[PDB]
Amino acid sequence: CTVAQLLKQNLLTFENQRIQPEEELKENLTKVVNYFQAPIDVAVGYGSGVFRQNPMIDFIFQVEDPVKWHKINLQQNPSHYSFVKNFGPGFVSTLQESFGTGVYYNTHVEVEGNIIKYGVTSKKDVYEDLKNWNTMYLAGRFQKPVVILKGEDEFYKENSYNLSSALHVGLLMLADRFTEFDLYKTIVSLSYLGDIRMSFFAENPRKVENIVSKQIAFFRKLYLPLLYAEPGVHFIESSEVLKSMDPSDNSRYLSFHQNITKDSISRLLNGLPLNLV
């Protein structure tokens, strides 16, 4: 619609996180998620097969107990898994060791007429990262546009503080004048190595600017309301511009002024998940 509409979103009901695809695509992704009978608490779609305009579709399943989750899923979907064999001596992992921590991926899996890759991880591990940034490896993925296909309201609540913290890190890094393009590129930079480390994508990493410009409408929807709520941040463009601006439009970028006094920088710093006591 318009950028002005995006400034009217209700943060208190997480409206800036409520990214959902078109009805038909959504139906397909939902059918994929529901195909799994092992209980998925939060299901995430992300990547080129979710944000379009054939390709493998990327998912994350946040589950209550991964060991048990894989026990069930090994019975229902045994051919989704491929294990390393014992060639030589050991490298023998237990259920808890291989499944209990991190993101475990089954890749190039056919589910309901789609080729998919899904990573399974502990919901508890994710929520702790969203709250404290223990590593930010999981949190960083959720500072950028994703689609929550299941457990939406529960997840959005846990993620709002992660998103506003990423904005605050951006504000700490940027000068008193910046464009929204500078902001989103800065925010993407924060998680760029973490996405590589976690193998969220089987394809080559992308250029930071291409990431931002392809998803410009979703970065605006997430962060413009947070900018609007932020004391000391001033939108420079007039009400007229913001009502004439399509969120999908890359041809011009909003500009801002922020307070960069010492007291302001101290409050940004001390509100970070890294600095909570």
Which residue ranges make up the site for a second copy (CB under 8 A)? 133, 136, 169, 172-175, 186, 189-190, 192-193, 196-197, 204-205, 207-210, 260, 262, 265-266, 269, 272, 274-275
Q: Which residue has the tokens 């600017």?
A: 209
Q: How far is the CB of 92 from Pt ion (least distance, A)?
A: 9
SS3 content of the chain, % helix, strand, coil (to 5): 50, 15, 35
Nearer to Pt ion, 232 or 247 (CB): 247
Q: Which does 79 bind (CB under 5 to 8 A by kind): a second copy, Pt ion, none?
A: none
Q: What is the dihedral of CA 261, 218, 240, 1, to 10 degrees?
A: -160
* Window 59-98: contact mask with Pt ion (x via CB under 5 A): ------x--x--x---------------------------
- CA 8/CA 2 separation, integer angstroms: 11
Nearer to a second copy, 159 or 165 (CB): 165
Q: How far is the CB of 83 from Pt ion (least distance, A)?
A: 5
Query: What residues contact 42, with CB distance under 8 A and at least 6 apart?
Result: 60, 61, 62, 123, 126, 148, 150, 151, 154, 155
Q: Which residue has the tokens 């998912």?
A: 59
Nearer to a second copy, 123 or 168 (CB): 168
Bridge partner residues of 60 (DSSP) = 44, 119
Q: Which does 277 bind (CB under 5 to 8 A by kind): a second copy, Pt ion, none?
A: none
Per CB under 5 A, 31 contacts Pt ion:
no
Nearer to a second copy, 244 or 275 (CB): 275
Q: Which does 229 bind (CB under 5 to 8 A by kind): a second copy, Pt ion, none?
A: none
Binding to Pt ion, residues 221-260 (CB under 5 A): 246-248, 257
- Which long-range contacts does 91-98 make (Cβ < 8 Å, 24+ apart)? 95/67, 95/70, 95/71, 96/67
- CA 274/CA 268 separation, integer angstroms: 11
Q: Which does 193 bind (CB under 5 to 8 A by kind): Pt ion, a second copy, none?
A: a second copy
Q: Which does 174 bind (CB under 5 to 8 A by kind): a second copy, Pt ion, none?
A: a second copy
Burial annotation 1-36 (CB, 10 A radius, 16+ → b, else e): eebbebbebeeeebebbebebeeebeeebbebbeeb
- Interface residues with Pt ion (CB under 5 A) are 65, 68, 71, 217, 246-248, 257
